[model samples]
Target chain A: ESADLRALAKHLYDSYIKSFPLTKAKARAILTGKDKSPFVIYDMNSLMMGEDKIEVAIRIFQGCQFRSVEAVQEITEYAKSIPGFVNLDLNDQVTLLKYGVHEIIYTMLASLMNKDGVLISEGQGFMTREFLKSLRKPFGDFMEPKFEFAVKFNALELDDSDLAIFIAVIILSGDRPGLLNVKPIEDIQDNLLQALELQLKLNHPESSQLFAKLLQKMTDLRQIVTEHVQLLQVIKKTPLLQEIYK
Target chain B: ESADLRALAKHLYDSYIKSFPLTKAKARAILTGKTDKSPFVIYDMNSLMMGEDKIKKEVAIRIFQGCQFRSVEAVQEITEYAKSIPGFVNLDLNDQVTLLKYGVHEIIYTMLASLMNKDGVLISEGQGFMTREFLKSLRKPFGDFMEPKFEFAVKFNALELDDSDLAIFIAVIILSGDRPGLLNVKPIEDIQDNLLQALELQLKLNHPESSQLFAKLLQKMTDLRQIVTEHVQLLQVIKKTETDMSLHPLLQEIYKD
Candidate 1:
């Protein structure tokens, strides 16, 4: 029996829904719950050009190190489980995972953010925008642009299921720098792109422009990843960051 | 009684296609569509060569044969197409002229999509593909003027619209209520509503596979509008400096800004 377009999209949705954690709703719930105030909240304005704010900024990067280290293992399992992901040569599979993880991680990170702050430590802590500015030279330069990206990415509000397929799309990118077999990876991307087009139509029928908007978001995330690696190069600490970025 | 939207779309699609007169290329070919005699030459104008009557005529004559001559006919063709629009004939006479005058430039840019290639616009209808670098080297406002037109056309044509989608899009543009100097806005808006209805139903029917194609086409109009705004500025400069160069009479009015 030949597969129709209808069933193909449903499977693409189903497999992704199962493969990626669809915790965005519960995550938002916790972030918005009555007792959900950030465990650590800093004054945004007081951090600028005044006293002792650099210490707070340094603490936030440490917080990020813990979160990012925790995320790497989760994303590793998630990429291998995506439909058609495991079929590639093991080295090529590793190449895709190695390069594409941070973009995927940051895209998921958007769900934990708002205009003013991003939820830290499982919605218990919130990091203020101005506090990052205090670590002005190297750390602030990198930290601020993610907030710029995250703020816009958050506004799109593409719930967990929507993010599922997009995360798959990001990991399986054929254009990632080096691969043993290029065409096989490209075939995977082409199908996912078609599935994404179908998924967007079904999910966002009223907004004809959302497909293009997500594409633009995907583009910004690539730039953010580039900036992330650039910052990692000069950072004088964090061996864990070195392992992933290396 | 409920109207059948597909049937409604069909009539607008049919009427507008009936009115859009293409095949200007074949008629142009009968006029000795010669490209061989003139190689793509960039005449570097210092006053001496520019003042030489022979070199000036050689370059000016080639541009006329390739470009300006068809614009005269193309401008005339637009009024015929716009009048075929269901409610366009009902507009007040002066409003009709104003809408058609302003809108004709955009329609010209849209039609240029058909005859365009990566190199540059096809001139003498389809006689030859003018090189982008060739047009850019013409100097000053005359130079670099064709880049945006080529830029817009390459992207527009990449959409691969059949004639059916284009017919109603042109009608929708022609009946624009936002057009300045319109004596009556309400009727134009009403006509635009129907054309857009026809277009949406028609585009969905035609392009079901590419879900975002219709939205992409809508954004392309914003790009076209900017191109026309630049054309007006460039044409204003041409009017003063290029004393020997004549725009078609309709274009002359449209370019008055």
Candidate 2:
């Protein structure tokens, strides 16, 4: 049971780890301009140099928010391809995706935040702490907790493969009440969970606490999403916020 | 890689199922006083105790004893299963103990619903089954600890998992390397990975149409962790407030940072 298992774990760990281009080291390199993999010229000084810093910040927030939504949509399609997912009734599938998308998106965004709680963008650049805090109320409050969660989560230092499996667990959750066929959904979730557990074991041998720590983060993610949704409801009356969400 | 794991999983599952009693049905029957065996004596508030303070303290002690008995037995069984895993004993002795101390409650919480009805957990096999309402009615410390756990247990029972599924799930929990102070993490992690993949294949074969079941079970592990975290926090409070009531050494080790 123990002998061949090690070899199997190593193989499983390597397969997924190779699929992603960016590691934490690589991401850090990109951020520091040591690696020119992906970048866009964001003249922050010029934006601040202008009279309408608020307009610049709002535009940047919307841009980042737009990218986030786009990523969520992409992952939603990715979820559709999982075998048991499509077997659900269309409404059930839609319900899972509708409620689950933001959690999935933020889980991915957690990777972008370094340990200091800076939010990152692939094309543009990082969101500075000062600029993020300077955003309007409710909006500022909404993002602050996300950065806090992101920083704490990033402290675990999971690679892309680990993050991918973790995200899979979130997307396949059967706990979202009012589902039509929870049994089947729960079954799908169990399968992904098993895969993730195996992969985490194979990948991070030295980091014994990674699996439990990561699993604990799921509850944190749920809490974060609850707060986020609550904020969205609170800020729904704000026209600018309304336009952004729209 | 896969074949050896299946053999190991089957061995562990058979061992766990073989050793344990079939208590869920019997527990329900006992609570209803419909069992073929001798029924436990019933006690109302008036009969059990006279004053409010007396009842509160009595209920709290019962709750504490009930939780302790089941959890202690569970830890032993999980420890045996871990030792049976080929390389688990090969790890440093301290790591083995650390893993068990930190992880036993999580495994216990994960399997708590296994012998549960919709109302609450079965505390004393076929003798005494605690109702959710009764657990909530107790005073501080004991009552607060049991409340979240019962809520989680009831929801988890809704999933209606089988013994076969739970046997392997327990194995996965035991082998988790996420516990603190491990001397060597690689071997432990490898064992856990192997068990997990075996579980994945098992779920796929058993519930072919339910791919999401595997993920859902994993999500429940997180829920179980959350409940345990809350339980531990409550323990911290108890330790602070009731210094006279010393915690068990085993429990102290388990809850230690």
Candidate 3:
């Protein structure tokens, strides 16, 4: 039973990641110092029937467990800032992730954004000055060293044929309501919040409308977390892990 | 567009007639009268996957449009005389038609109950009866007729295939939701009432849980119809129909086990 939950979480993560685009040219702009890029979003139609690169991106995302909320956020903001949201494909919504300036600037953005090399989390303090300043502190002087951890986090790792179906089954399990919130994946709500903010910025919508929808959604999520957490925890704690082999 | 509708209805009607079983089955039992069985009620799951014959029976119920409250009341009372409803399949909270055992005992029911033979004696009467009891009475007591007279009624000619898909599709157009409510089609609410009563009888339950769910669903459907009829009509009209001669290979690529 617990295995079912894990399988489901992993699958949802995979499917969500697999269906999303990685070549978010707009998203990369923030990292490479390019302005005027827009945010991108994927809807049901484009995600389902789009190109081969989309399939590649999705496979990679599944490997990453759909945890790149910040990354996706950056892409959308780029699109919105560039004021190119309206120019995007009606079916795709990809221009929200495109670059409005020169190709060289786009390349720099791409390089900064790529999942191909080092997995560094911190750079120049763009958003949080205090956090960036604290990075200079010695181990005892601050909240631990601000060193980069090179733990393997590839979206492509999940592309193996053997693991695909197992992952697919888990994703399909998320078909039921309240099934998704069961997974103990880290900071999922935070990720969604960040993603939503990025989308709002990209779209430049009525702030009240965005805030209202976000608050309602978050409140609903909180209710789910509070109500179902105990039941899910119980499901997770059962000692039947290897007992299934019996 | 209307011509296409007629063609489709004819196809469905023919299929239904051709497939009329020796004994009562779903659409066959209800439309062609191959069964002496009572009215049937089904759950949602059964309803979705229901057999072709039952679907045809449903089509038949829709064929006669614009039934009045009084006529429907009489039909309901007549139907209730039988131990079972004749053709209902699933017992979803949203069923629209209900036929009583007694209703099937009527001449119209008897006509449907008959089968085609080599000499086609039953076929001749069944064709006439189906039109007279089911079709002619649809529009305000003979305001219009598709075949014009028995001299030209399409049912005058019959073949196995002729009785099946093509014939059925022709009949289905008259029965389609496009028809005016004042015609032969039983009021949905009335059909629903008969169905609920039938469900209550067949399930032999002390209380109606499924019935309540169905009522709520019908309310939702009513709400949608009230709000979205025009949009739905536009979609159905503008949506281009593309027939894929071959299945997409990507389906295999994506879903490979």
Q: For residues B46-133, could you state the per-residue lDDT of candidate 2 as single tens digits?
A: 4334323322235576557556666777777777767776677888898888878767888777666665555655544544345666
Cα lDDT tens digits for candidate 3, B1-257: 44443443444333444433322233334344554532232223333234223432233222322122223433433333221222223222222222221111121222222332222112211221132333333333222232222311122222122222222212211122211222333343233333333322322232333322211221122222222223233223323331212222422121121
TM-score of chain A of each: 0.81, 0.77, 0.19
| Candidate 1 residue spans exceeding 4 A from truth | A1-22, A34-38, A43-59, A62-66, A89-95, A177-186, A197-209, A226-245, B1-257
Q: What lDDT score goes with residue B115 in model 2?
A: 50
Tens digits of per-residue lDDT for model 1, B1-257: 11565665666656655554543233223223445423232324443243334332655335543466667677777777777777788779988988887778788888877766676554433433456666677656666677888888877877777667877777777876656678987788777766666676778778887554654565466567768877777777877887777666655667666
Q: Is candidate 2 or candidate 3 better by DockQ?
A: 2
| Model 2 stretches with alpha carbons more than 4 Å out | A1-102, A110-172, A177-246, B1-3, B17-43, B46-57, B205-211, B240-243
Error (Å) of candidate 1 at residue A8 is 6.1
Question: TM-score: which candidate is best?
Answer: 2
Error of 1 at B150 (Å): 14
Task: For candidate 3, report its TM-score.
Answer: 0.16
Docking class of 2: incorrect
Ranking by lDDT: 1, 2, 3
TM-score for model 2? 0.62
Q: Can you write out model 1's per-residue Cα lDDT over A1-246, one digit (the tens) per residue?
A: 113434555665565555445356655775667454545455644433322322555655666776777777777777766667889888889999888888987887778766666666556566666656656567778667777788777766777657766777678765466788876776776566656656777777875445545754664676678778778777755366657634
In candidate 1, position A200 carries an lDDT of: 75
